[PDB]
Amino acid sequence: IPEWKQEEVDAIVEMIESRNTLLERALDD
Amino acid sequence: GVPPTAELIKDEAGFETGSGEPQEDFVADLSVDQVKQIAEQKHPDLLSYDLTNAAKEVVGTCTSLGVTIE
Amino acid sequence: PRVELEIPEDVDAEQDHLDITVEGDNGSVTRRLWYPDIDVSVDGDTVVIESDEDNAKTMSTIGTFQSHIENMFHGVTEGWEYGMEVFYSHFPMQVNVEGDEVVIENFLGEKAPRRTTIHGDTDVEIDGEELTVSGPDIEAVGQTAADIEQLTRINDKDVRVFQDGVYITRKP
RNA sequence: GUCUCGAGCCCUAGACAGCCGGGAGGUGAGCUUAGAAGCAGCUACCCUCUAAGAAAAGCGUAACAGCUUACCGGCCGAGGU
Ligand SMILES: [Mg+2]
């Protein structure tokens, strides 16, 4: 689990509140 | 129709030609307010939204010439 | 290893012994797929290529058999086509189809016509300076196209200067 | 060529390869030079937008252009190195 892939999800989720797999990952939670 | 960066620096500095090695040989000097004017002009030439980031691009040519800041 | 190829609706495939025949709207192609302990069979609407052996040499032919079958599928439906362009610098070259062979006259100013027989049910059609080799069997079509280009192969002189000859332009 | 055994690293948060799409602005970096704009040489090699995109890795031109490179995204789907 590369750290950049984790930091990305957090960055995506941060924008949802205010790669396709990472977008979905962020959507899920 | 706004001219390139290199020119505007030589205008508000006093010197024309740069140097063989940048940063290692300081030619001219620019102040805080002097660099703020250059960023005011170039708006379409730069992609930045804020006026803050526009200045960073300009400095990206100055230090690579020999221009200290005060 | 076992590989299953679902045959297209346009296509129908029969098989007896070591020979596989594939038919479609564009025609039929029959091939002999023979290699130690590699069984190729037609299980309804799927062609199966299997073997109990899994060494490098067996796996190689299995991959080869698959492409041969997929190509037969493609050839009996969409067909195979190669495009060729006839180029000449000084002497006007005459390329024509006479029976089951293409004839090239006046190549480099030669009196004697160069020629090559066409393989299988391959069709060669010429539109001025353009030629199009086509048919169901990629083996026969690919060879005919290559044969035409090879027919104008020059060994004796510098090719960078003497470049006349029909060349394969489009490959499927 | 082929068979067998071991170690490291990568991978279904999609690896390796292929194909498709993107490969962007400051500005042709500065110097040098009549000019050299990724790619003659010397030196620097910095920051914007962004999912990426070198002060340019290999060709290319008189110089540009142009073609690919890294780098990012997609299709695919299982091992790859
Ligand atoms: Mg000789």
Swiss-Prot record, chain A:
Residue intervals passing through the bilayer: none
Assembly with partners or alone: Part of the 50S ribosomal subunit. Forms part of the ribosomal stalk which helps the ribosome interact with GTP-bound translation factors. Forms a heptameric L10(L12)2(L12)2(L12)2 complex, where L10 forms an elongated spine to which the L12 dimers bind in a sequential fashion.
Family: Belongs to the universal ribosomal protein uL10 family.
Protein function: Forms part of the ribosomal stalk, playing a central role in the interaction of the ribosome with GTP-bound translation factors.
Note: Has been called L10e and L10E in this organism; in this case 'e/E' is for E.coli-like, not eukaryotic-type protein.
Protein name per Swiss-Prot or TrEMBL: Large ribosomal subunit protein uL10
Curated annotation (Swiss-Prot), chain B:
The organism of origin for this protein: Haloarcula marismortui (strain ATCC 43049 / DSM 3752 / JCM 8966 / VKM B-1809) (Halobacterium marismortui)
Superkingdom per UniProt: Archaea
Included range, full protein: 67 to 136 of 162
Subunit and partners: Part of the 50S ribosomal subunit. Forms part of the ribosomal stalk which helps the ribosome interact with GTP-bound translation factors. Forms a heptameric L10(L12)2(L12)2(L12)2 complex, where L10 forms an elongated spine to which 3 L12 dimers bind in a sequential fashion.
Signal sequence, renumbered to the chain: none
Family membership: Belongs to the universal ribosomal protein uL11 family.
Known role: Forms part of the ribosomal stalk which helps the ribosome interact with GTP-bound translation factors.
Protein name (database record): Large ribosomal subunit protein uL11
UniProtKB/Swiss-Prot annotation, chain C:
Top-level taxonomic group: Archaea
Cellular component GO terms held in the UniProt record: cytosolic large ribosomal subunit
GO molecular function: rRNA binding; structural constituent of ribosome
GO biological process: cytoplasmic translation
Key word rRNA-binding present: yes
InterPro entries, alphabetized: Ribosomal_uL6-like, Ribosomal_uL6-like_a/b-dom_sf, Ribosomal_uL6_a/b-dom, Ribosomal_uL6_arc, Ribosomal_uL6_CS2
Keyword Lipid metabolism: no
Keyword field: Ribonucleoprotein, Ribosomal protein, RNA-binding, rRNA-binding
Function: This protein binds to the 23S rRNA, and is important in its secondary structure. It is located near the subunit interface in the base of the L7/L12 stalk, and near the tRNA binding site of the peptidyltransferase center.
Quaternary context: Part of the 50S ribosomal subunit. Interacts weakly with protein L13.
The family this protein is said to belong to: Belongs to the universal ribosomal protein uL6 family.
Name recorded for this polypeptide: Large ribosomal subunit protein uL6
Lineage of the organism: Archaea, Methanobacteriati, Methanobacteriota, Stenosarchaea group, Halobacteria
Gene name for this UniProt entry: rpl6
